[PDB]
Symmetry: none
């Protein structure tokens, strides 16, 4: 179930994005509703450090690929 | 007439990407191999759908679009593009490049019918550059030190890897590699390079000199 | 027309170099095998980029340049080089050997167009000797 | 007519070199100041004899000779040198540049008589470049870290100083300074630079951004 | 008096913002000088935790509403 | 002719917002009730000044401006806006929407004189959407 | 003919900047003093290299570029700029303002030859404004 | 006296070179005999670490400045 | 036998070189194989201090005479 | 016609070198004595083979080669060398000086036939200087 996917405290972001995109594209949603759902799940899941990282984006991110690129650039190396 | 790529080659390439990663030189060589004949947008799109995961595939779609847009800007900046024609009726729109134009959506046969060879090679080069960008993006040189027990060839391999797989310009890699050989590479090799009667002006020459005069231990 | 080497053979050769090393006689035999047809500078350059690590690749670039320079000295010492021609307009510069000349930089098709078979075999022998030197030097 | 430089200015410059050193930007500015009018070999030779110690003076004589030899090679490579003439009888030998030619040894008046203005400016530029070389030689960027208690402007000053006063090419200083800002500069500022909504492509822009958004403490 | 308004140690930020905007708009300042004054009072008043929170803003905040939104997002829940 | 809203209704709505909050469905229903007739910029501005605190009022001014700008972009994207006219001389500027145009600043009578009914309904819908945004943002 | 600024004045100004700082009114007065005659890009560049530290010098290069770009935008917005000419062949490019144009790179004599007095005063005012910005930013 | 100058166990090399060049140039030697004497004093004084450093010079050093530059380059940082 | 010649712990280097060159030239080797053998015996015999001295030669020594000269220059006086 | 040096004188000189050493003034005087008449490369080579040990002989071969190379550089710098001739066909190669040229290898009679007296005196002076260098180097 896509709506139950959370980014674990120790999980990296690319694994979380892979799992989420897999569960959203392999589901019962229409094809035209996958990108907005993936974006809004990146924003509300993806534990509050990345949540604030996406929130304070000086540019407007309108695509899952752009969000992934931005987060991978500005992520907290740890 | 359109002929699909072998699923055996595609499966082997997918497993190569799965084990070696996106950035290994063997993987880029394999991609260049399967990028030899000019591919139709359908072929490259399905290829990247199969070999790349979901998130790298999204990144690659973005990068491919950006590179194709740069190509179309250069095309409107020069009416002699091998994708363009002489009159204005042959100007190539992004719907024709991404395979979204009329008579092409989902049909590879019609795609191969209406597309130009210049269109195909431009699409292919754009896709290759986008793959390179995404590979460089998906996965620090100034923090590399030669360990107390590490050999010098391992340190040189690690350093050259991290310097060439970084964000430096191509014309700034050799001086950085040299100056990192001189300041890293624990003080025995530092003094060995310092007291070089000849002037070493290349990483290969420094490596050869150090391998010759190194303290066998 | 340029045809690339199989990435399957290149992957097998890379794993051979990874397990057996650079100096084993089986590795040199495999390199001689993949060095059978005269290769263009693009082919040999990418091959050494893939099979060799970063530091051995730097060493190999150095050694290849030195051997090509010896070849060009022998070429200016004999106007009957299979890479040269009879007139002075066919003299072969190192930009043409290393693939740096005009119409060749980054393009293997144009490379295969302008290059001579003698040029190709000289480049290939030079690359093989450079590989031997670097293998003897690395370990 | 030859006029000597003031011993007061020379004494002040010597004390500047004594307190600030050879490589400080104020010292190089003062040398450029006293290197304004084209000097005769006698003037520059005595100036370097007075302001430099014995060993730096030996080094400077060596470097000046090498630079003058490069100048004479360029002069024999171009008959239109402002020191040369059109015919072969005006070709300038190193004895005339170093002040060793006939009618010049030890006599500044005769020196000023026979020398050309192009000769003077070439000698002067050669001496300035030699001074720069010796100053860079007489007295490590990749070992610079921002201390736990150090401010960011001090760290940036130290890093830019060590990078610009090093053996790197001029075209490789800005990328190195940027990549050292990103990997040094302890992880709070590292994350501050990483999460930059804009792309910072200049050390000045990075410094401005960090100074704006820094944690006041 | 607007220039004497400080955020108390126990006061929330929305109460402080309400009080400050009230005192600044109900004062003798020209209409074109209220927003810059409100911003610069948010930055120098509003006890040093929120001061540092506003200082380390990756984006440039150029409006009292934007500053209020940012602070309400990233405030220390307590 | 301009008629003001009853201060009794405004006081009741202010106390509703004070006890129930900004986001309760009863509060949104009450706002929709007092948002029934098309209001002039003066009316909505004073209403939000009274019912909202200082910080929510700043947020609401921001959001109202943004929504009005979207409306004006749609208006320049379609010359058939009920606020626009057919010729270019009836194009509606943001000074006329926010009540800042000439003959309107501070005067509700002149405001009601020069404004169009389409202008009024667009301003009203914009203010309602801005209130929804701020209510979703405040808590 | 180009005449350099006295290194004595430059040394005194550098020590003034060292003791008083960048923002003191005495320092700005001294800079205005040494900014009296229109300077060539070489002069201002070397002056800021000597009086400013490395990081303030980087900041000043950035700010000077931005201000010169604003000047060039105003210049393309008005063909009557004292740096411009009447025809299109006298339009002033940023390579000519920053001293990067042909016949100017590293040579102050040629610089003084090809530059216009309007060019010089515009460069000087731009450099002064950039110095003010950097001084306000550094402390 | 120039012929009594030794590089101390703790003294740096530039101080030793300064002292030696001072004592040699401020002495009774002819001007044409100072450079060879300075070189041969660099080689025989200047305690055996620097002695061996100068001895094993792949290039031939024929000037006090060149010897000083070489030693400063390849000296044992300590 | 040349292949059994070692430099003794107390023996000087010129004596060792004399003994080695004597035994190599007065042996059954071809004339064209004496110099490489003498060099490679200098490198592997000649106890590890001189071994490291020859190893760390900034120049390439390609003759027994050159090796002897280099070692005599940079040898540890004792 | 070639006449060999007496083995009695050579034995006495060898014992002198054995007891007094290479650097004694008596030894250098004796060498100058046996270096009086211009010797052929064969004579000097055998003389140094007999009087010098193996390692000094290697050093002396090196030094003799270097000095002969300096002589040949001076010879190509002056066509009036007593070893050279006027035309280019008499230019003296190092194979002719070291006795390696055609018709000379191992044969002292042919050597004495083809060699010039200037060649002989140059070879002799070169050998004497090389002996001096090696003697100064050995101890």
């Amino acid at each position: 179930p896509w709506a139950d996917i959370m980014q674990g405290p120790s999980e990296s972001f690319v694994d979380f994005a892979n799992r989420l995109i897999k569960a959203v594209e392999g589901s019962d949603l229409p094809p035209s509703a996958r990108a907005p759902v993936i974006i809004d799940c990146f924003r509300q899941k993806s534990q509050p450090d990345i949540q604030q990282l996406i929130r304070t984006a000086p540019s407007t991110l309108t695509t899952p690929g752009e969000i992934i690129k931005y987060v991978l650039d500005r992520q907290k190396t740890a």
